[PDB]
Design a protein around this motif. Structure first.
Motif, short mmCIF file in Angstrom:
data_model
loop_
_atom_site.label_atom_id
_atom_site.label_comp_id
_atom_site.label_asym_id
_atom_site.label_seq_id
_atom_site.Cartn_x
_atom_site.Cartn_y
_atom_site.Cartn_z
N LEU C 4 106.45 67.40 88.32
CA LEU C 4 106.36 66.25 87.43
C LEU C 4 107.65 66.07 86.64
O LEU C 4 108.40 67.02 86.41
N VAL C 6 110.07 65.49 83.46
CA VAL C 6 110.13 66.12 82.14
C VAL C 6 110.85 65.18 81.18
O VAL C 6 111.89 64.61 81.52
N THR C 7 110.27 64.99 80.00
CA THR C 7 110.86 64.12 79.00
C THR C 7 110.99 64.84 77.66
O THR C 7 111.86 64.50 76.85
N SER C 8 110.13 65.84 77.43
CA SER C 8 110.10 66.57 76.16
C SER C 8 109.96 65.62 74.98
O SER C 8 110.60 65.79 73.94
N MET C 9 109.12 64.61 75.15
CA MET C 9 108.98 63.53 74.18
C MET C 9 107.76 63.70 73.27
O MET C 9 107.90 63.68 72.05
N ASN C 15 98.03 68.04 69.00
CA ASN C 15 97.41 69.15 69.70
C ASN C 15 97.26 68.78 71.17
O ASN C 15 96.92 67.64 71.50
N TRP C 16 97.52 69.74 72.05
CA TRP C 16 97.45 69.53 73.49
C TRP C 16 96.54 70.58 74.12
O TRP C 16 96.66 71.77 73.83
N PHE C 17 95.64 70.13 74.99
CA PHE C 17 94.73 71.02 75.70
C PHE C 17 94.67 70.78 77.20
O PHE C 17 94.34 71.72 77.94
N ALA C 19 96.36 70.45 80.59
CA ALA C 19 97.52 70.61 81.46
C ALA C 19 97.29 70.02 82.85
O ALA C 19 98.03 70.35 83.78
#
Lengths: 105, 52, 50
Positions: C4, C6-9, C15-17, C19
């Protein structure tokens, strides 16, 4: 083996003094162990790291793992450099749900 | 004899030969939902879970 | 396998759950190309037709 709380027993009898034990394997054998476990045996997490104060940065992705890249330079020496970081964390929920398995004789 | 080696140049192409690689198995199988977004370095260095 | 972009934006104070997201992008280009036009000049029902 709790004699006052029998609810949490997980072994038939207590380990008294003088009980004989043994170690599985060979004196100085080396090998690559096989593994078998359950879903809720061990856990994995990658903490997201924050930016630094006024330093160019970006985020990359590689199989669901985010890595933060920082770009900066040294003034007097006139040298440029980069760095990549990641912060992991581990848990062990229940040791009784995993281990190592080998072919039996 | 002709000494005409100064009429040509040594060229290194802009192509990279393939390298070696490994595979990811253990990372996919373990669970990541329970520990995700639960501990922060500022808050501390440890988070806990309750046994049944 | 899936790779995928990548932007690191995002994840900037969020919060992220999950993937289970793969980032795919569509790429648009405009080019100047040479094309041959054929002029069918049949007189019946209009003649000039390229």
């Amino acid at each position: 083996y709790d004699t006052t709380n029998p609810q949490y027993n997980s072994v038939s009898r207590q380990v008294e003094a003088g009980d004989a034990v043994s170690v599985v394997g060979t004196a100085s054998q080396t090998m690559k162990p096989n593994l078998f476990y359950n879903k809720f045996f061990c856990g994995l997490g990658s903490i997201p790291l924050p930016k630094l104060h006024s330093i160019d940065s970006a985020v990359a992705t590689y199989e669901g793992f985010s890595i933060r890249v920082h770009k900066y330079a040294d003034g007097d020496a006139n040298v440029q450099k980069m760095r990549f970081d990641l912060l992991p964390a581990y848990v062990c929920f229940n040791p009784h749900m995993g281990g190592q398995f080998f072919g039996n004789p | 004899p002709n000494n005409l080696d100064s009429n040509v140049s040594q060229i290194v192409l802009k192509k990279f030969l393939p390298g070696f690689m490994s595979d990811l198995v253990l990372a996919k199988t373990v669970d990541r939902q329970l520990l995700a977004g639960e501990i922060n370095s500022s808050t501390g260095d440890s988070v806990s879970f309750k046994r049944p | 396998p899936t790779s995928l972009d990548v932007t690191s934006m995002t994840s900037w104070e969020y919060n992220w759950f999950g993937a289970d997201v793969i980032y795919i992008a569509k790429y648009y280009e405009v080019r100047k190309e040479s094309v041959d036009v054929i002029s069918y000049r049949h007189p019946i029902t209009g003649e000039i037709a390229t």
